[PDB]
C-alpha cells in the first residue's frame, strides 16, 4: 500500500512539470523537495501526507 | 607510559610507540638548545606526529590532550559527536591551524640548532623525539664531535616524518603577512606578478636549509620523474603563501595581420612552478586549423571579454561569466513505466513485510543543484606528502604494473568508442567529438600531439547534471572536458590502458567481463595460495573530490614510465605539465560561467578508472608499510620480517637511491601475504589474518589512519566489510554480491546485484525508450542477464524475480538457440565457463 | 565538407568576441609589467567594465551590495539592475527585510564601473 | 496529454479520505490557491462558489478540509471586506484563509 504511493507522486511531479511549474523558482523548489522527501518516506503517514500538498499544488493551478 | 620513538639501531628500527656528556658545552650558546644540568615539557613534536599519523577514534587521547594543553580549543569541545571529520564539521581545521604557529617556531629553532653543530664540528642524527613541543632540542647520546665548522647533521627522517602535517596545520601562514608577524596586515602583493622563484627559495632557506637534495622552483630544469615529485611536494607547500589570482594561464598579446588576442604562452602551476612555452610566433597571418582549434579551447579569449564575476553560492575562486544571463539548470524527474508495475503486483509482488521493495527513484533536483554539488570542491585541500615515504611507494607501485607494454602511438592506429561525447567547451557548440574527428587529418592530430609534446594548452570543461537512477539524494554531476585534451591524452595513453584491459590475473581487473566464468577466475587468483586468509574490503570518501594533487601527480608520473624509449625528460615533463593543466586544475563552465578546480579528478577523463586504481594501490602499499614500520621490533618474533622491517626502514629514511633488490623483496612479501584485486575505487584483498592481527600486514585501522592523514578524508567501519568464512564470496564489489552454488558437478562462485535495484531500473526509464518497443527489450534482455544468478538463491522471492522479468521478455516477445532470448537456457549459457 | 563549416563557425566566434576585448585598460595593463606576460586572473578583474553579483539570501546582500554603489576589486561599482532567479526585474525598494521570503533568491546584480 | 488519464486513474486507486475529499471538494469549484501546510499552521485561501453547499465546509466557525480542521480567523470576499452571516446578495468567490 506504500509503493503505489511513491509511485503515483512520479507522474505527479512529471505532468507538474508539463504544466510548467518549473519555469517558476520558488514553486519547483518546494515540489522537488516535497517529492524527493517522499521517496525516502519509511512511513506511509507522512507519505500521504505530502502527497496532499503535492496534489493540491496541481489544484491550485487552472490548467 | 606509552611514547612515540624513531628508532633505528642494527637490532630495531621503527616509527612506532614503546616503553619509557661533554657535546653540551659546545651547544649552550646556541638559543635553541634546551638547558641541561630542565623546563622541558610533557609531549614531544614525535607524539605530534604519531597522534596526526596514526589516528583512531576512542583512543586518541593524546591528540586531545595536546589540543586543550595548548589553548587550540576548551574542555567542552569534543563532546559533540563527530568532531574529527573533514567533511562534517569542517571547522576542526581552523582548531588545527591554531597549532600552525607552534610547528612553524619549532622549524626555526631546528635551522638554529643544526646551525651550531655544523659551527662545533658534531655530526648525528637529529629525530623528532629529541624536540619539544616548545620546540628546544635535547638528548646529547649520538652525538660525536670532529674539526669545528665541519660539523654535519642529519635531517632526512625528521623533515620526511614531519612534512603531511606542516599543511594540515597551516604552519606557513605567517608568511603571509607583512613583517612575518600574525599582528599585522596582510602583504599586498602586485597583481602583475606571477615568478615569486626568489619567494621560494627564501622560503627553502629559511625553513629547509639543511635539506640535503636540491629543490627545484620550476620543475622544468628537474633531471627525473622522482625530482619531479620531490621539488613538487615541495612547491605544494610553498604555493600557500602566493595570491590564489597570480595562478592559472600566463597571457600575452600577439598580433594577427594587425588584430590583437590575448592567448596563454605559460602556466603557473601551484605544483610546478612556472612553465613558459616553446613555440610562442608574437606575429602572425592566416592561422590555419591547429592554431584556430588550440585559440578557442584556452580560457584566454573567455575570461578576457567575459564579465566579471562575484558568486557568494560558493567559496571556489571564480573567473568570470561567460554570459549576461545566469543559468540555472534542473533535472526531470523519471518517466515511469505502467505496464511493468501492473504485472508485477498481477503477479504477488510489492506486497506488505516483502524482502525485494522499490528503493531506486530517479530523483529530481531544482536549479540551485549545479553549483552546490560544485561546491564539494571544499574538500580538497593542498596535502604534502611525506617525500621519502611516497618515493619508495612510487616504486613499489611501479611493479604491479611491469606486466604491461605503453608507447606514445601514431595517429591513424587509435581506436575510437562511442564517438559521441560532449566535446567540451566551446566545442560542443558546433557538434560532438565525431564532427572533429573527421574535420582533422591525421597529420594534423599528429602536429597537435607534438605540439602539446612542447607547450601547455589549458583547456575548459562543462560540468553537467546526469539523467540517472540512485538510491541517493544527491545529484549526479557530469564532467566533459575538451577534445583538445581527449586528442592527445587518447594518443599518449591508448596502448597502455589496452593493456592494462586484456591481460588476466593481475592485481588490476579492469575490463575483464564477470560472464563465463570471469568472477570465478578472478577470485582464485585474488586467492591465490595465503595461508589463515580472510577476505576484507574498504570504501573511498569522496573519493573524486579529496583525492589530493601530489597523488595525482604520482598516478601520472608512474602510468607515464612507460615512456622511456618514445620521449626525453622534457617532452614526458610536457607532457605532464599538459595534463594538470588539462585534468586537474583547469576552468570549469558551470552555469555560464567560469571556475578553477582546486584539484580533483574529472569523471569523465578516460584515464580515469586507472588512475584511481592507481591511487588505490598507493594507498594499500601505504598502509602496509606503515603497519610493518609502526610494530614494536622486539615483540616480532619470525626472523624474516624483522630484517625486512629493518631493511624497510633503513631504505626509507637512510638511503637515497632506489634499492632493487628490496623492492622485488617487499613486492613478492606483499604478494604472497597480501592479494589484492583493484578495479578502479573498489578494492578486495585476501590477507593472511594471523600476521594481520599482529601487525606484520595492513588491517583496516591502517588504512582508517593512511586516508586521514594523507586524503583528508575520514573513513568509518560502515561501509568497510571484513570476511572470516571464505566459502562465501566478497561481501562487495562493484555493486555485486557473490555465492558458492553447485553446477556442473563442481562448485563455482556467481555474482548476483541487488534485486531492488533491479526492480528499480525496470520500473523507471531515462525516457529514451518509451518511443520505442525495441530498445524496450533489449533493456529488459539485459537486466534478465544481470538477474538469471538469482535463480540459485536460497529465497524464494529473490528466486522469484527472475521469473518475472522472463515473463515479460515473452511477453513483450508475444506482443510484437543460443539467438533465442526468450526461453530461460540462453542466460544460462551466459554464466558457463564455456566460451559470446 | 563540414571541416569548412565548422572552421568559419570558430573564426566567426573569435572575430566576434574580439569586438568586445579591447578596453584600452588591457593596454596599460600588458605594458606595465615585464615581457607583457600577466596572469590571466586579473584581467577581468582589471578590465571588465561590467560586474554580476549572484546573491543567494539577504543576510549577504546586506553585506555586499548596500546602497546603489558598493566597493569590490579596490573599485567603485554602480548597480545598474537587479533580477531574480526567473529574469523577472526587480527594484531596489523591494529587497527588505520583511519582503526578502516574497523574493525569488537566488538575484543577479548587474553593475557598472564607475 | 494521456498523464492526466494516467494520474487519476491511479489516485481514485489509493483510496485516502485526504485525497478524494480534495478532489470532489475541487471538482465542483472549490479549489485553493496555495498549499496546506503540514506543520506550522500557515494561512491557505480557499475560494467557494456562492454557497457551494457551505455547511460541508464549516460548522460553528470550524473549517473541514482534506480531513482535517481549521480555525477561521479573517474571511474577505470578492469585495475586499469582512462579510459576516441574505444569502443572494453576496460575490462569488469567498476566501476563507485560516491558520
Ligand atoms: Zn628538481
Ligand atoms: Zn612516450
Redesign the interface.
Known amino acids: 500500500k506504500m509503493s503505489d504511493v511513491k509511485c503515483t507522486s512520479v507522474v505527479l511531479l512529471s505532468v507538474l512539470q508539463q504544466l510548467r511549474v518549473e ?4 514553486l519547483w523548489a518546494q515540489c522537488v523537495q516535497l517529492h524527493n522527501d517522499i521517496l525516502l518516506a519509511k512511513d506511509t503517514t507522512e507519505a500521504f501526507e505530502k502527497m496532499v500538498s503535492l496534489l493540491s499544488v496541481l489544484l491550485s493551478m487552472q490548467g | 607510559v606509552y611514547r612515540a620513538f624513531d628508532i633505528y639501531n642494527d637490532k630495531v628500527a621503527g616509527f612506532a610507540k614503546f616503553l619509557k656528556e661533554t657535546i653540551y658545552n659546545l651547544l649552550k650558546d646556541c638559543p635553541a638548545v634546551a638547558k641541561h644540568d630542565q623546563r622541558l615539557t610533557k609531549y614531544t613534536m614525535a607524539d605530534l606526529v604519531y597522534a596526526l599519523r596514526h589516528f583512531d577514534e576512542g583512543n586518541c587521547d593524546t591528540l586531545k590532550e595536546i589540543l586543550v594543553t595548548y589553548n587550540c580549543c576548551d574542555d567542552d569541545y569534543f563532546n559533540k559527536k563527530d568532531w574529527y571529520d573533514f567533511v562534517e564539521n569542517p571547522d576542526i581545521l581552523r582548531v588545527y591551524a591554531n597549532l600552525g604557529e607552534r610547528v612553524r617556531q619549532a622549524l626555526l629553532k631546528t635551522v638554529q640548532f643544526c646551525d651550531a653543530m655544523r659551527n662545533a664540528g658534531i655530526v648525528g642524527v637529529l629525530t623528532l623525539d629529541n624536540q619539544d613541543l616548545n620546540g628546544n632540542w635535547y638528548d646529547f647520546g649520538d652525538f660525536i664531535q670532529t674539526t669545528p665548522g665541519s660539523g654535519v647533521p642529519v635531517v632526512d627522517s625528521y623533515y620526511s616524518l614531519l612534512m603531511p602535517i606542516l599543511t594540515l596545520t597551516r604552519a606557513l601562514t605567517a608568511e603571509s603577512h607583512v613583517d612575518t608577524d600574525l599582528t599585522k596586515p596582510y602583504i599586498k602583493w602586485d ?2 606578478k ?1 615568478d615569486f622563484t626568489e619567494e621560494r627559495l627564501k622560503l627553502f632557506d629559511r625553513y629547509f636549509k639543511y635539506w640535503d637534495q636540491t629543490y627545484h622552483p620550476n620543475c622544468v630544469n628537474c633531471l627525473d620523474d622522482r625530482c619531479i615529485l620531490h621539488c613538487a611536494n615541495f612547491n605544494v607547500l610553498f604555493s600557500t603563501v602566493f595570491p ?10 600577439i598580433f594577427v595581420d594587425g ?4 592567448v ?3 602556466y ?1 602551476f601551484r605544483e610546478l612552478g612556472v612553465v613558459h612555452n616553446q613555440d610562442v610566433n608574437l606575429h602572425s597571418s592566416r592561422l590555419s ?1 591547429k592554431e ?2 588550440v ?2 579551447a584556452d ?15 560558493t567559496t571556489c ?1 571564480s ?3 561567460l554570459t ?3 543559468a ?1 539548470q534542473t533535472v526531470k524527474p523519471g518517466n515511469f513505466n505502467k505496464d511493468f508495475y501492473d504485472f508485477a503486483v498481477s503477479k504477488g509482488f510489492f506486497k506488505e513485510g516483502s524482502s525485494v521493495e522499490l528503493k531506486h527513484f530517479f530523483f529530481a533536483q531544482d ?2 543543484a549545479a553549483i552546490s554539488d560544485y561546491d564539494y570542491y571544499r574538500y580538497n585541500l593542498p596535502t604534502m606528502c611525506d617525500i621519502r615515504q611516497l618515493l619508495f611507494v612510487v616504486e613499489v607501485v611501479d611493479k604491479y604494473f611491469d606486466c604491461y607494454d605503453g608507447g606514445c602511438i601514431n595517429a591513424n592506429q587509435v581506436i575510437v568508442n562511442n564517438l559521441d561525447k560532449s566535446a567540451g567547451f ?1 566545442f560542443n ?3 560532438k567529438a565525431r ?2 574527428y ?3 587529418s591525421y597529420e594534423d592530430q599528429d602536429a597537435l600531439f607534438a605540439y602539446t609534446k612542447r607547450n601547455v594548452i589549458p583547456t575548459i570543461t562543462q560540468m553537467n547534471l546526469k539523467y540517472a537512477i540512485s538510491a541517493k539524494n544527491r545529484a549526479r554531476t557530469v564532467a566533459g572536458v575538451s577534445i583538445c585534451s581527449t586528442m592527445t591524452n587518447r594518443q599518449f595513453h591508448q596502448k597502455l590502458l589496452k593493456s592494462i584491459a586484456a591481460t588476466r590475473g593481475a592485481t588490476v581487473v579492469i575490463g575483464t567481463s564477470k560472464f563465463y566464468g570471469g568472477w570465478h577466475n578472478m577470485l582464485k587468483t585474488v586467492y591465490s595460495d595465503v595461508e589463515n586468509p580472510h577476505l576484507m574490503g574498504w570504501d573511498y570518501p569522496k573519493c573524486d573530490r579529496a583525492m589530493p594533487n601530489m597523488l595525482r601527480i604520482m598516478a601520472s608520473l608512474v602510468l607515464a614510465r612507460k615512456h622511456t624509449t618514445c620521449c626525453s625528460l622534457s617532452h614526458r615533463f610536457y607532457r605532464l605539465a599538459n595534463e594538470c593543466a588539462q585534468v586537474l586544475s583547469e576552468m570549469v563552465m558551470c552555469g555560464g560561467s567560469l571556475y ?1 578546480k582546486p584539484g580533483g579528478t574529472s569523471s569523465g577523463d578516460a584515464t580515469t578508472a586507472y588512475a584511481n586504481s592507481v591511487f588505490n594501490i598507493c594507498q594499500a602499499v601505504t598502509a602496509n608499510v606503515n603497519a610493518l614500520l609502526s610494530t614494536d621490533g622486539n615483540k616480532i618474533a619470525d626472523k624474516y620480517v624483522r630484517n625486512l622491517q629493518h631493511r624497510l626502514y633503513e631504505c626509507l629514511y637512510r638511503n637515497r637511491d632506489v634499492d632493487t633488490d628490496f623492492v622485488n623483496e617487499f613486492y613478492a612479501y606483499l604478494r604472497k601475504h597480501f592479494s589484492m584485486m583493484i578495479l578502479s575505487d573498489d578494492a578486495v584483498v585476501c590477507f593472511n589474518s594471523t600476521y594481520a592481527s599482529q601487525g606484520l600486514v595492513a588491517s583496516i585501522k591502517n588504512f582508517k589512519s593512511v586516508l586521514y592523514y594523507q586524503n583528508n578524508v575520514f573513513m568509518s567501519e560502515a561501509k568497510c566489510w571484513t570476511e572470516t568464512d571464505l566459502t562465501k564470496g566478497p561481501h562487495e564489489f562493484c555493486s555485486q554480491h557473490t555465492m558458492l552454488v553447485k553446477q556442473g558437478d563442481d562448485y563455482v562462485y556467481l555474482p548476483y546485484p541487488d534485486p531492488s535495484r533491479i526492480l528499480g531500473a525496470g520500473c523507471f526509464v531515462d525516457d529514451i525508450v518509451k518511443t520505442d518497443g525495441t530498445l524496450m527489450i533489449e533493456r529488459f534482455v539485459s537486466l534478465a542477464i544481470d538477474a538469471y544468478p538469482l535463480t540459485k538463491h536460497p529465497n524464494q522471492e529473490y528466486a522469484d524475480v527472475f521469473h518475472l522479468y522472463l515473463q515479460y521478455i515473452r511477453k513483450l516477445h508475444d506482443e510484437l538457440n543460443t539467438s533465442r532470448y526468450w526461453e530461460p537456457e540462453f542466460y544460462e549459457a551466459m554464466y558457463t565457463p564455456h566460451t559470446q | ?3 569548412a ?3 568559419s ?3 566567426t ?2 572575430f566576434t ?2 569586438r ?3 578596453n584600452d585598460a ?2 596599460n ?2 605594458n ?2 615585464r ?22 539570501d539577504y543576510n ?1 546582500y546586506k553585506n ?1 551590495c548596500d546602497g546603489t554603489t558598493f566597493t ?2 579596490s573599485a567603485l561599482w554602480e548597480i545598474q539592475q537587479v533580477v ?4 523577472k526585474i526587480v527594484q531596489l525598494s523591494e529587497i527588505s527585510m520583511d519582503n526578502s521570503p516574497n523574493l ?1 533568491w ?1 538575484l ?1 546584480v ?1 553593475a557598472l564601473r564607475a
Open positions: 519555469s517558476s523558482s520558488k | 597583481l602583475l606571477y590564489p589570482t597570480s595562478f592559472g594561464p600566463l597571457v600575452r598579446k588584430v590583437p588576442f590575448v596563454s604562452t605559460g603557473h586549423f584556430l582549434l585559440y578557442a580560457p584566454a579569449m573567455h575570461a578576457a571579454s567575459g564579465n566579471l564575476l562575484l558568486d557568494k553560492r575562486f573567473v568570470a561569466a549576461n544571463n545566469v540555472f536549479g540551485n566551446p557548440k558546433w557538434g564532427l572533429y573527421d574535420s582533422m578553477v | 565538407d563540414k571541416r563549416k565548422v572552421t563557425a570558430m573564426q566566434m573569435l568576441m574580439l568586445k576585448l579591447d588591457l593596454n595593463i600588458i606595465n609589467a615581457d607583457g606576460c600577466v596572469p590571466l586572473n586579473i584581467i577581468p578583474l582589471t578590465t571588465a567594465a561590467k560586474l554580476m553579483v549572484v546573491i543567494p549577504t555586499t569590490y576589486a531574480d532567479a526567473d529574469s525569488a537566488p543577479i548587474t
